[PDB]
Amino acid sequence: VIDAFRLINANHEPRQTTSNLGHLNKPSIQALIHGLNRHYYSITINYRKNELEQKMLLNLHKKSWMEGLTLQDYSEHCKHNESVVKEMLELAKNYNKAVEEEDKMTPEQLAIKNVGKQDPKRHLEEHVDVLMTSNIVQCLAAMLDTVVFK
Amino acid sequence: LLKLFTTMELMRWSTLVEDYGMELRKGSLESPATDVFGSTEEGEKRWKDLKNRVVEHNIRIMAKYYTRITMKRMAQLLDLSVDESEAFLSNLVVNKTIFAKVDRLAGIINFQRPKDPNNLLNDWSQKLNSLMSLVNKTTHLIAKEEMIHNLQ
Amino acid sequence: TRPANHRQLTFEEIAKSAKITVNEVELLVMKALSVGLVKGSIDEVDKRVHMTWVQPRVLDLQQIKGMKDRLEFWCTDVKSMEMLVEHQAHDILT
Amino acid sequence: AVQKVVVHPLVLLSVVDHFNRIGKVGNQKRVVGVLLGSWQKKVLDVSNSFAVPFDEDDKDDSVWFLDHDYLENMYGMFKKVNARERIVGWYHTGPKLHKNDIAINELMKRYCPNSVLVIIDVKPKDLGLPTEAYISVEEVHDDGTPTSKTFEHVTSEIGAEEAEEVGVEHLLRDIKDTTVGTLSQRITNQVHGLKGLNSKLLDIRSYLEKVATGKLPINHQIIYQLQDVFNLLPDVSLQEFVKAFYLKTNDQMVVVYLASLIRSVVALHNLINNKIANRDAEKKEG
Amino acid sequence: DKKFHGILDQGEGVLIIFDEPPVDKTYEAALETIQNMSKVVDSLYNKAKKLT
């Protein structure tokens, strides 16, 4: 949240118009209340950047290369998998207990069925995505290493 | 004596008794003896104790290397007949001192713990990670040497 | 000298290349390990010995070439499988 | 010993701005300055920087000027603005290590004995971090005999406070692909790591070529290190290792199979609900 | 009564000793989840009729 200003004198229109470049921002209610376009006027802000700035701003979030080919402590892998599956067991039970409804529930009542109560479907979707991504990545790393280093 | 008990290599009781036997138990006029190994009953008890400690250090030293060692060869090297060496090993294991499985049926003493596949792959991973770090370090030394010798 | 794959000696070979009787071989390797020359173990049951690593030793200008060729093989493998990954995974990561 | 050094995005961007300003001034190929920060029990914290006029003779690596008086004045003014930050080291934008580095470091070593050097390349032709950190230590040889001072590499990374994170994420609207899912954990790695490993191996191979062809002398610590490297490489033809690998791959597969079953059931349920909704809408419409 | 781990060998008069993880606690959870979603599919079928 940022903006650039300048002062309007006591003279009419403060500035002249030869494009739509001024009128693209829809000034906020608070700024108007506190004096915008009455005592001061805004100016468009441009964040233009050169080539080397662009190249380093892209290079901040980049980890070392070794991190790419590091496996996980396999024991921790298995513990994580068994924990999530032991959660999916109960989530599947609740999914069953919840699909049986949705017929004996008013079309409006459903929109409130899920407020303060776990929903099995969404959690199952999240856990399935997590499990499947993690396992695929670990497997691929293991195979890729198995080949690269002798 | 101190170094012998800190060096990692099998030591023979016979050599220790032959060399330091007189300098410890019977004493020396130039170097006074101590009541540690005198003729009292406690002297015999502590002499047995020193025997025990040489034997246990021998067992441990072969228990670092020596994945497998036939019962007869351990007993021969420890200077005990088969039975007493077996009893000493059994007591040591029962007391949690060292880990080993006596295969009395085949006469083998295995010093290797089980290798669950999890641990095997974990060792593989540690090896790869060390490989990666050494690659990085060798590249740094290469850059240094090239800088020192190449500008000229 | 033994290639990396095998590197699993036998007592008899020690006794024949060191001029010692088989009975006294074990102490030799035991000591070698103790000092810090080689890491490994012993198999008294089978009268063999595994040497997981040997102390670094200076190499002439020939073994240097062998090591370089091994590095070339390594680089070729790495590029091959980087390409495999990228190509097979193109659509997602464009 | 430093276990880790963390630089801040502001420092990187400030060094880039410095190099741009001097190059616009021209007739230079490197820049030198300071680095401000604090310590957190061996976990350094670089947080800010400023310039220090410097010039060098490219032809001979024994002539150089560095206005240390400027350094003291700027340290006074910055310390007036922010007390919690004290000099931590020095930085320069040359591609790779120069010969003067030990000389400058011994000059800098007065202001902070535990001074770490951070090189910030401003033109990355690679896939890797933009900084390298180096700490000067005495090296005693078994045969190399004379004891000189050599740089030992120390782990470095990039870190940011919430304000810097906000600003950078704002500016990073030039390209953005989050896809934290499998897409990232397969572009940020696998491919990236293989490319980096290949580049490193290629550098090792170039040096080996140069030594073998006589262009250089032989270094024995390098040869021992390479022998250890080749000795580390594992063997993948051991029945025990194959057995372990298959066992673990199998477990990973059972989990992915369960995941896919779950997903199929959910998608089918969604299709059924949509069909029922369509049928009801038609019946009500009819 | 599962006091310790191993089994005898009659005739030869031997006594083997080992260590066994009889269960893995990551396949049991999977089997239970398969059963639970079998029940869920049954429920969807019972709710597939309305479509007819």
XYZ file of C-alpha atoms in Angstrom:
734
model
C 0.000 0.000 0.000
C 1.734 3.114 -1.302
C 1.079 6.288 -3.279
C 2.761 9.483 -4.472
C 1.283 12.951 -4.033
C 1.749 16.645 -4.752
C 0.041 19.848 -3.664
C -2.815 21.622 -5.455
C -2.676 25.397 -5.132
C -5.529 27.755 -4.234
C -6.507 28.635 -7.821
C -10.078 25.233 -12.740
C -8.327 21.886 -12.856
C -4.974 21.238 -11.158
C -3.547 19.233 -14.057
C -4.205 18.748 -17.762
C -5.340 15.499 -19.378
C -4.005 13.908 -22.541
C -4.538 10.192 -21.828
C -6.303 7.729 -19.566
C -3.088 7.205 -17.598
C -4.370 9.383 -14.778
C -7.790 7.792 -14.360
C -7.159 4.141 -13.631
C -7.007 3.869 -9.817
C -10.378 4.712 -8.223
C -9.102 6.644 -5.180
C -10.081 5.194 -1.820
C -12.792 6.579 0.443
C -10.377 7.259 3.300
C -7.946 9.224 1.136
C -10.812 11.309 -0.239
C -12.136 11.953 3.251
C -8.699 13.142 4.371
C -8.170 15.515 1.455
C -7.359 13.682 -1.772
C -8.066 15.553 -5.012
C -8.919 18.668 -2.972
C -5.562 19.782 -1.528
C -3.273 17.184 -3.148
C -3.394 14.885 -6.160
C -1.917 11.453 -6.751
C 0.629 10.286 -9.331
C 1.022 6.867 -10.898
C 3.868 4.771 -9.473
C 6.054 2.638 -11.745
C 8.387 -0.080 -10.499
C 10.566 -0.284 -13.597
C 13.570 -2.560 -13.211
C 16.778 -3.171 -15.141
C 18.148 -6.536 -16.227
C 20.407 -7.325 -13.268
C 17.706 -6.426 -10.748
C 15.370 -8.803 -12.549
C 18.006 -11.505 -12.544
C 18.691 -11.324 -8.815
C 15.037 -10.952 -7.778
C 14.450 -14.293 -9.491
C 17.557 -15.744 -7.835
C 16.559 -15.141 -4.217
C 14.203 -18.074 -3.736
C 16.571 -20.601 -5.296
C 17.966 -23.296 -3.021
C 21.306 -24.981 -3.528
C 21.517 -27.817 -6.024
C 22.200 -30.523 -3.438
C 18.823 -29.944 -1.794
C 17.222 -31.050 -5.039
C 18.697 -34.547 -4.900
C 18.422 -35.233 -1.169
C 16.119 -37.969 0.009
C 14.334 -37.921 3.363
C 15.057 -40.006 6.410
C 13.169 -43.046 5.219
C 11.989 -43.882 8.724
C 10.405 -40.437 8.939
C 8.843 -41.082 5.523
C 7.150 -44.247 6.730
C 6.011 -42.663 9.976
C 4.442 -39.784 8.048
C 2.679 -42.152 5.644
C 1.248 -44.334 8.395
C 0.095 -41.296 10.351
C -1.807 -39.852 7.392
C -3.380 -43.189 6.484
C -4.456 -43.710 10.090
C -6.170 -40.339 9.737
C -7.808 -41.288 6.432
C -9.386 -44.291 8.147
C -11.518 -42.081 10.376
C -12.094 -39.569 7.596
C -13.540 -42.353 5.431
C -15.807 -43.438 8.277
C -17.078 -39.866 8.602
C -17.464 -39.622 4.807
C -19.751 -42.628 4.924
C -21.689 -41.168 7.843
C -22.064 -37.920 5.893
C -23.010 -39.145 2.405
C -25.970 -41.019 3.902
C -27.248 -37.535 4.684
C -27.514 -34.890 1.914
C -30.814 -36.532 0.962
C -32.571 -36.071 4.306
C -31.357 -32.472 4.522
C -33.057 -29.313 3.335
C -31.391 -27.563 0.370
C -30.663 -24.586 2.627
C -29.808 -26.688 5.693
C -26.772 -28.116 3.899
C -25.139 -24.693 3.592
C -25.068 -24.684 7.410
C -24.297 -28.384 7.880
C -20.639 -27.393 7.442
C -20.046 -24.731 10.070
C -18.037 -25.913 13.047
C -18.217 -29.522 11.845
C -15.375 -31.273 10.036
C -16.136 -32.134 6.408
C -14.708 -35.484 5.258
C -14.604 -34.747 1.520
C -12.296 -31.731 1.514
C -9.906 -33.192 4.069
C -9.704 -36.414 2.087
C -8.864 -34.405 -1.022
C -6.101 -32.524 0.786
C -4.554 -35.615 2.358
C -4.686 -37.540 -0.901
C -2.862 -34.750 -2.705
C -0.223 -34.544 0.037
C 0.427 -38.283 0.218
C 0.578 -38.733 -3.523
C 2.888 -35.771 -4.217
C 5.298 -36.640 -1.414
C 5.564 -40.285 -2.377
C 5.987 -39.546 -6.082
C 8.796 -37.067 -5.371
C 10.631 -39.427 -3.013
C 10.343 -42.305 -5.479
C 11.626 -40.253 -8.378
C 14.563 -38.956 -6.358
C 15.456 -42.470 -5.256
C 15.423 -43.787 -8.835
C 17.247 -40.780 -10.264
C 20.023 -41.174 -7.688
C 20.087 -44.957 -8.133
C 21.130 -44.230 -11.716
C 23.267 -41.102 -11.483
C 25.850 -42.197 -8.885
C 27.249 -45.320 -10.542
C 50.368 -49.611 31.383
C 48.216 -46.548 30.733
C 49.008 -46.453 27.016
C 48.579 -50.205 26.663
C 45.108 -49.712 28.106
C 44.407 -46.822 25.724
C 45.933 -48.262 22.534
C 43.500 -50.235 20.366
C 45.160 -53.583 19.834
C 44.941 -56.998 21.427
C 47.288 -57.461 24.382
C 48.402 -60.768 25.841
C 48.061 -61.306 29.557
C 51.269 -63.281 29.389
C 53.254 -60.271 28.205
C 51.724 -57.981 30.832
C 52.449 -60.403 33.682
C 55.966 -61.096 32.422
C 56.951 -57.446 32.152
C 54.968 -55.559 34.813
C 54.288 -58.625 36.944
C 57.118 -57.849 39.342
C 56.852 -54.057 39.140
C 53.246 -54.126 40.361
C 52.708 -57.026 42.764
C 56.100 -57.650 44.408
C 57.126 -53.994 44.241
C 60.457 -52.321 43.552
C 62.996 -50.874 45.959
C 63.640 -47.979 43.576
C 59.941 -47.603 42.740
C 57.807 -48.314 45.820
C 55.005 -50.810 45.402
C 51.431 -50.092 46.453
C 48.879 -52.071 48.417
C 46.959 -52.366 45.141
C 48.288 -55.851 44.401
C 49.823 -57.018 47.683
C 49.528 -60.514 49.137
C 46.317 -59.856 51.075
C 43.041 -61.474 50.075
C 41.988 -58.169 48.545
C 45.211 -58.363 46.559
C 44.115 -61.605 44.953
C 40.679 -60.096 44.346
C 42.096 -57.060 42.537
C 44.518 -59.263 40.584
C 41.507 -61.183 39.347
C 39.969 -57.797 38.594
C 42.909 -56.800 36.381
C 42.692 -60.107 34.549
C 39.033 -59.403 33.978
C 39.676 -55.947 32.590
C 42.328 -57.155 30.135
C 39.928 -59.857 28.934
C 37.041 -57.416 28.541
C 39.203 -54.920 26.650
C 40.313 -57.741 24.336
C 36.684 -58.682 23.751
C 35.706 -55.094 22.985
C 38.647 -54.538 20.645
C 37.766 -57.572 18.579
C 34.157 -56.407 18.939
C 34.805 -53.254 16.927
C 36.186 -55.112 13.907
C 35.700 -58.893 13.552
C 32.162 -59.204 12.248
C 32.461 -62.953 12.810
C 34.960 -64.965 14.829
C 34.831 -68.676 15.465
C 34.361 -69.512 19.130
C 37.566 -71.534 19.134
C 39.596 -68.696 17.689
C 38.231 -66.154 20.146
C 38.954 -68.543 23.014
C 42.488 -69.175 21.743
C 43.175 -65.449 21.335
C 41.696 -64.560 24.736
C 43.767 -67.340 26.331
C 40.822 -69.282 27.730
C 39.420 -72.714 27.038
C 36.165 -72.748 25.113
C 33.784 -72.923 28.055
C 35.093 -70.068 30.177
C 35.322 -67.726 27.198
C 31.736 -68.631 26.283
C 30.591 -67.917 29.832
C 32.430 -64.603 29.837
C 30.775 -63.592 26.574
C 27.345 -64.649 27.820
C 27.708 -62.611 30.995
C 28.954 -59.610 29.047
C 25.954 -59.700 26.711
C 23.439 -60.264 29.510
C 24.858 -57.216 31.280
C 24.391 -55.041 28.142
C 28.157 -54.431 27.816
C 28.472 -55.546 24.175
C 26.248 -57.021 21.477
C 26.849 -60.399 19.868
C 25.034 -63.631 19.061
C 26.678 -66.974 19.809
C 25.612 -69.571 17.239
C 26.633 -72.428 19.502
C 25.462 -74.914 16.872
C 27.961 -73.743 14.239
C 30.553 -72.208 16.572
C 30.222 -68.634 15.299
C 30.077 -65.342 17.203
C 28.381 -62.671 15.141
C 29.056 -59.065 16.088
C 26.723 -57.506 13.512
C 23.338 -56.057 14.385
C 20.360 -56.670 12.101
C 20.190 -54.522 8.982
C 16.601 -53.463 8.439
C 16.080 -52.098 4.911
C 15.277 -48.697 6.376
C 18.767 -48.436 7.880
C 20.353 -49.763 4.697
C 18.784 -47.054 2.549
C 19.568 -44.461 5.211
C 23.249 -45.403 5.021
C 23.037 -45.156 1.235
C 21.629 -41.640 1.617
C 24.351 -40.564 4.028
C 26.929 -41.839 1.556
C 25.419 -39.855 -1.317
C 25.244 -36.712 0.801
C 28.912 -37.018 1.757
C 29.757 -37.565 -1.911
C 27.968 -34.349 -2.788
C 29.777 -32.338 -0.135
C 33.165 -33.671 -1.240
C 32.375 -32.720 -4.840
C 31.654 -29.188 -3.686
C 34.854 -29.007 -1.628
C 37.052 -30.357 -4.415
C 35.617 -27.703 -6.706
C 36.478 -24.981 -4.196
C 40.078 -26.180 -3.943
C 40.252 -26.304 -7.740
C 39.097 -22.703 -7.975
C 41.699 -21.682 -5.398
C 44.571 -23.416 -7.194
C 43.521 -22.002 -10.554
C 43.429 -18.525 -9.014
C 46.891 -18.945 -7.504
C 48.557 -20.280 -10.650
C 46.554 -19.013 -13.642
C 46.645 -15.216 -13.470
C 50.309 -15.667 -14.397
C 45.068 -52.705 -6.556
C 41.985 -54.896 -6.342
C 39.101 -53.294 -8.272
C 36.475 -51.487 -6.228
C 33.776 -54.066 -6.956
C 35.611 -57.066 -5.487
C 37.972 -55.637 -2.858
C 37.383 -58.726 -0.684
C 40.699 -60.420 0.078
C 41.439 -63.845 1.511
C 43.719 -64.773 4.389
C 45.663 -67.193 2.213
C 46.478 -64.367 -0.198
C 47.728 -62.203 2.675
C 49.898 -65.092 3.867
C 51.292 -65.617 0.372
C 51.992 -61.935 -0.371
C 53.321 -60.949 3.088
C 55.322 -64.087 3.981
C 53.352 -64.837 7.145
C 51.469 -67.919 8.301
C 47.692 -67.813 8.093
C 47.386 -68.018 11.872
C 49.125 -64.684 12.450
C 47.492 -62.795 9.567
C 44.543 -61.590 11.638
C 46.695 -59.477 13.945
C 48.208 -57.706 10.943
C 44.882 -56.494 9.574
C 43.553 -55.816 13.061
C 46.491 -53.468 13.586
C 46.181 -51.889 10.138
C 42.592 -50.951 10.927
C 43.523 -49.755 14.410
C 46.166 -47.294 13.228
C 43.882 -45.758 10.600
C 45.155 -47.071 7.260
C 42.007 -48.894 6.095
C 38.452 -49.301 7.399
C 36.576 -52.570 7.132
C 36.045 -55.771 9.059
C 37.151 -59.398 9.246
C 35.353 -62.665 8.498
C 37.209 -65.239 10.579
C 34.562 -67.833 9.714
C 35.222 -67.585 5.981
C 38.836 -66.360 6.285
C 38.086 -63.252 4.209
C 38.246 -59.513 4.837
C 36.324 -56.515 3.447
C 38.216 -53.252 2.943
C 35.693 -50.446 2.641
C 38.334 -47.777 2.023
C 42.108 -47.398 1.680
C 44.272 -44.487 2.695
C 44.713 -41.958 -0.119
C 47.882 -42.397 -2.133
C 49.622 -40.200 -4.664
C 49.008 -41.066 -8.306
C 51.117 -40.454 -11.382
C 49.958 -38.883 -14.618
C 48.412 -42.144 -15.865
C 45.885 -42.932 -13.143
C 44.924 -39.277 -13.483
C 43.622 -40.089 -16.950
C 41.674 -43.086 -15.697
C 40.032 -40.888 -13.093
C 39.200 -38.291 -15.748
C 37.622 -40.924 -17.994
C 35.522 -42.128 -15.087
C 34.409 -38.532 -14.650
C 33.423 -38.361 -18.330
C 31.281 -41.463 -17.942
C 29.687 -39.813 -14.923
C 28.921 -36.590 -16.807
C 27.407 -38.473 -19.754
C 25.141 -40.457 -17.445
C 24.045 -37.302 -15.660
C 23.122 -35.491 -18.861
C 21.306 -38.481 -20.294
C 19.014 -38.749 -17.342
C 18.501 -34.982 -16.937
C 17.242 -35.071 -20.521
C 15.013 -38.055 -19.821
C 13.431 -36.244 -16.890
C 12.896 -32.961 -18.696
C 11.434 -34.492 -21.857
C 9.123 -36.939 -20.118
C 8.023 -34.107 -17.815
C 7.638 -31.362 -20.405
C 3.941 -30.657 -20.522
C 3.559 -29.900 -16.821
C 6.721 -27.861 -16.430
C 6.757 -25.803 -19.606
C 34.014 -21.357 12.921
C 30.695 -20.143 11.506
C 27.985 -22.759 11.059
C 25.933 -20.563 8.728
C 25.690 -17.063 7.267
C 22.368 -15.473 6.310
C 22.279 -12.512 3.942
C 19.248 -10.318 3.440
C 17.628 -9.446 0.090
C 18.286 -5.761 0.709
C 22.037 -6.435 0.743
C 21.921 -8.282 -2.573
C 19.862 -5.604 -4.256
C 22.091 -2.872 -2.836
C 25.210 -4.533 -4.220
C 23.528 -4.852 -7.616
C 22.630 -1.163 -7.498
C 26.250 -0.382 -6.575
C 27.635 -2.345 -9.511
C 25.142 -0.721 -11.860
C 26.089 2.757 -10.641
C 29.847 2.157 -10.973
C 29.542 0.442 -14.348
C 27.448 3.368 -15.518
C 30.476 5.265 -14.227
C 32.424 2.590 -16.114
C 36.048 1.501 -16.295
C 35.643 -1.154 -13.604
C 35.100 -4.886 -13.344
C 34.569 -5.311 -9.599
C 33.112 -3.454 -6.648
C 34.009 -3.573 -2.957
C 32.146 -2.524 0.169
C 31.249 -3.562 3.678
C 28.492 -5.607 5.304
C 26.630 -4.680 8.476
C 25.017 -7.142 10.848
C 25.028 -8.949 14.170
C 25.603 -12.427 15.586
C 23.250 -15.038 17.021
C 25.696 -17.559 18.512
C 27.499 -18.705 15.364
C 24.453 -18.023 13.084
C 25.508 -14.766 11.455
C 22.995 -12.146 10.319
C 23.926 -9.743 7.522
C 21.325 -7.020 7.178
C 22.665 -3.933 5.403
C 25.576 -2.553 3.423
C 27.206 0.574 2.056
C 29.908 1.420 -0.426
C 33.645 1.959 -0.029
C 35.691 3.552 -2.847
C 38.213 1.109 -4.248
C 40.417 0.674 -7.305
C 42.869 -1.931 -8.523
C 45.477 -2.635 -11.184
C 44.186 -5.421 -13.410
C 47.602 -6.214 -14.870
C 49.445 -6.759 -11.564
C 47.634 -8.086 -8.498
C 49.709 -6.115 -6.003
C 48.381 -2.557 -6.457
C 45.103 -1.476 -4.892
C 43.495 1.369 -2.972
C 40.635 1.160 -0.470
C 39.697 4.349 1.350
C 39.417 2.947 4.858
C 38.754 6.485 6.073
C 35.490 6.386 4.134
C 34.745 3.108 5.875
C 35.200 4.631 9.318
C 33.081 7.688 8.500
C 30.259 5.602 7.072
C 30.406 3.287 10.046
C 29.949 6.324 12.243
C 26.932 7.568 10.307
C 25.252 4.170 9.957
C 25.874 3.404 13.620
C 24.153 6.695 14.304
C 21.139 5.546 12.274
C 21.041 1.934 13.536
C 23.003 0.943 16.627
C 22.135 -2.773 16.635
C 24.208 -3.360 13.477
C 28.000 -3.576 13.559
C 30.470 -4.398 10.804
C 30.448 -8.090 9.962
C 32.670 -8.447 6.914
C 33.155 -7.287 3.356
C 31.797 -8.106 -0.096
C 32.852 -7.784 -3.711
C 31.189 -8.417 -7.051
C 33.972 -10.076 -9.004
C 32.955 -13.406 -10.495
C 35.408 -15.602 -8.581
C 38.102 -15.321 -5.952
C 40.936 -12.885 -6.644
C 44.514 -12.853 -5.414
C 44.223 -9.667 -3.351
C 41.495 -11.230 -1.240
C 43.835 -12.254 1.579
C 45.441 -8.810 1.611
C 42.117 -6.989 1.894
C 40.837 -9.449 4.468
C 43.911 -8.835 6.625
C 43.170 -5.139 6.246
C 39.530 -5.698 7.139
C 40.468 -8.079 9.919
C 41.095 -5.096 12.170
C 37.452 -4.034 12.209
C 36.155 -7.538 12.863
C 38.550 -10.442 13.520
C 35.826 -12.959 12.658
C 35.388 -11.362 9.252
C 33.641 -13.411 6.562
C 33.895 -12.520 2.878
C 30.726 -12.696 0.782
C 31.039 -12.607 -3.006
C 27.867 -11.544 -4.821
C 27.969 -12.303 -8.528
C 25.628 -9.986 -10.434
C 25.299 -12.026 -13.669
C 24.398 -15.615 -12.802
C 25.042 -18.011 -15.691
C 24.089 -21.063 -13.642
C 21.289 -22.588 -11.563
C 22.309 -21.908 -7.973
C 22.649 -19.429 -5.161
C 23.994 -15.945 -5.958
C 26.424 -15.643 -3.015
C 29.522 -17.435 -1.746
C 30.959 -16.959 1.756
C 34.594 -17.486 2.752
C 36.458 -17.290 6.089
C 40.220 -16.834 6.315
C 42.113 -19.500 8.239
C 45.714 -20.574 8.736
C 46.509 -23.810 6.916
C 49.336 -26.067 8.114
C 50.621 -28.682 5.678
C 52.132 -32.134 6.041
C 54.444 -31.310 3.114
C 53.272 -27.919 1.800
C 55.232 -26.651 4.837
C 54.911 -22.776 4.859
C 51.719 -21.749 6.697
C 49.680 -19.293 4.615
C 46.102 -18.065 4.984
C 43.480 -19.712 2.768
C 39.745 -19.153 2.540
C 37.504 -21.908 3.901
C 34.008 -21.972 2.425
C 31.159 -21.700 4.918
C 27.483 -22.403 4.371
C 25.430 -19.392 3.280
C 21.760 -18.712 2.595
C 19.229 -15.934 2.029
C 16.837 -14.726 4.703
C 14.323 -11.945 5.044
C 12.177 -10.205 7.615
C 8.453 -9.789 7.040
C 8.899 -6.318 5.543
C 11.504 -7.510 3.052
C 9.411 -10.560 2.212
C 6.407 -8.343 1.496
C 8.407 -6.001 -0.709
C 10.147 -8.727 -2.692
C 6.949 -10.700 -3.241
C 5.430 -7.460 -4.497
C 8.251 -6.797 -6.947
C 8.319 -10.444 -8.075
C 5.333 -9.701 -10.313
C 7.479 -10.334 -13.379
C 7.197 -14.136 -13.220
C 5.439 -16.359 -10.645
C 4.635 -20.097 -10.536
C 3.880 -21.466 -7.065
C 2.255 -24.883 -7.788
C 3.647 -26.032 -4.451
C 2.461 -29.450 -5.509
C 4.443 -31.950 -7.453
C 5.320 -29.415 -10.175
C 7.561 -27.422 -7.843
C 9.139 -30.400 -6.111
C 10.046 -31.592 -9.631
C 11.221 -28.372 -11.259
C 13.055 -26.962 -8.224
C 14.917 -30.257 -8.022
C 15.579 -33.421 -9.985
C 16.184 -31.311 -13.098
C 17.820 -28.439 -11.221
C 19.986 -30.707 -9.105
C 21.081 -32.790 -12.067
C 22.030 -29.641 -13.971
C 24.088 -28.365 -11.046
C 25.825 -31.694 -10.494
C 26.686 -31.775 -14.178
C 28.179 -28.289 -14.071
C 30.309 -29.134 -11.023
C 31.539 -32.379 -12.559
C 32.388 -30.477 -15.720
C 34.528 -28.019 -13.754
C 36.355 -30.911 -12.090
C 36.899 -32.429 -15.524
C 38.266 -29.193 -16.980
C 40.800 -28.935 -14.159
C 41.775 -32.576 -14.547
C 42.322 -31.960 -18.254
C 44.498 -28.949 -17.497
C 46.682 -30.875 -15.052
C 47.034 -33.870 -17.356
C 47.970 -31.704 -20.336
C 50.698 -30.006 -18.288
C 49.135 -26.538 -18.191
C 49.245 -26.720 -14.364
C 51.116 -28.501 -11.567
C 49.828 -31.414 -9.505
C 48.103 -30.823 -6.169
C 48.089 -33.784 -3.824
C 45.213 -32.815 -1.535
C 42.976 -32.605 -4.611
C 44.053 -36.055 -5.739
C 43.373 -37.556 -2.314
C 39.974 -35.843 -2.206
C 39.050 -37.185 -5.628
C 40.111 -40.675 -4.600
C 37.838 -40.431 -1.570
C 35.034 -39.170 -3.827
C 35.365 -42.129 -6.169
C 35.514 -44.452 -3.180
C 32.225 -43.105 -1.808
C 30.181 -43.942 -4.934
C 27.812 -46.790 -3.999
C 27.304 -50.050 -5.852
C 23.771 -50.922 -6.931
C 24.284 -54.612 -7.772
C 24.183 -55.980 -4.231
C 21.256 -58.296 -3.600
C 20.829 -56.731 -0.167
C 20.536 -53.246 -1.632
C 18.196 -54.308 -4.432
C 16.030 -56.065 -1.880
C 15.848 -52.969 0.283
C 15.089 -50.663 -2.650
C 12.269 -52.870 -3.919
C 10.784 -53.185 -0.441
C 10.635 -49.433 -0.003
C 9.329 -48.733 -3.510
C 6.551 -51.239 -2.848
C 5.455 -49.481 0.339
C 5.428 -46.130 -1.442
C 3.249 -47.681 -4.186
C 0.649 -49.081 -1.813
C 0.208 -45.616 -0.364
C -0.163 -43.944 -3.776
C -2.643 -46.650 -4.814
C -4.809 -45.954 -1.778
C -4.637 -42.242 -2.543
C -5.822 -42.763 -6.115
C -8.706 -44.983 -5.003
C -9.830 -42.239 -2.628
C -9.666 -39.648 -5.404
C -11.596 -41.780 -7.893
C -14.406 -42.358 -5.420
C -14.636 -38.635 -4.682
C -14.729 -37.669 -8.368
C -17.411 -40.274 -9.078
C -19.451 -38.902 -6.202
C -19.135 -35.440 -7.707
C -20.315 -36.714 -11.097
C -23.303 -38.408 -9.475
C -24.248 -35.249 -7.612
C -23.992 -33.168 -10.776
C -26.115 -35.687 -12.679
C -28.771 -35.695 -9.963
C -28.766 -31.899 -9.918
C -29.167 -31.762 -13.702
C -31.988 -34.318 -13.626
C -33.784 -32.398 -10.892
C -33.374 -29.139 -12.794
C -34.795 -30.726 -15.946
C -37.733 -32.330 -14.115
C -38.535 -29.020 -12.439
C -38.166 -27.295 -15.808
C -40.353 -29.813 -17.646
C 1.987 -67.476 25.363
C 4.473 -65.247 23.521
C 6.852 -64.970 26.486
C 9.860 -64.563 24.171
C 10.804 -64.971 20.517
C 11.839 -68.126 18.712
C 10.935 -71.746 18.192
C 12.402 -75.133 19.057
C 13.553 -77.853 16.672
C 12.570 -81.334 17.801
C 14.863 -84.231 16.997
C 17.861 -81.932 16.590
C 17.497 -80.423 20.067
C 18.090 -76.839 18.937
C 16.504 -73.564 19.996
C 16.419 -70.731 17.495
C 16.111 -67.115 18.592
C 15.218 -64.163 16.403
C 13.312 -60.879 16.387
C 10.076 -60.380 14.448
C 7.882 -57.335 13.800
C 4.715 -59.401 13.277
C 2.763 -56.339 12.052
C 3.596 -53.097 10.229
C 0.688 -50.757 11.158
C 0.666 -49.169 7.674
C -0.989 -51.973 5.744
C -3.653 -52.543 8.405
C -4.732 -48.912 8.160
C -4.917 -49.241 4.380
C -7.054 -52.370 4.571
C -9.456 -50.709 6.990
C -9.725 -47.698 4.681
C -10.482 -49.996 1.738
C -13.298 -51.556 3.746
C -14.635 -48.146 4.726
C -14.760 -46.945 1.136
C -16.397 -50.188 0.109
C -19.138 -49.124 2.498
C -19.103 -45.644 0.941
C -19.482 -47.079 -2.573
C -22.391 -49.161 -1.335
C -23.878 -45.901 -0.080
C -23.400 -44.189 -3.443
C -25.086 -47.109 -5.194
C -27.990 -46.886 -2.756
C -28.009 -43.231 -3.783
C -27.575 -44.041 -7.477
C -31.150 -45.350 -7.683
C -32.699 -41.868 -7.543
C -31.135 -41.213 -10.931
C -33.229 -43.979 -12.549
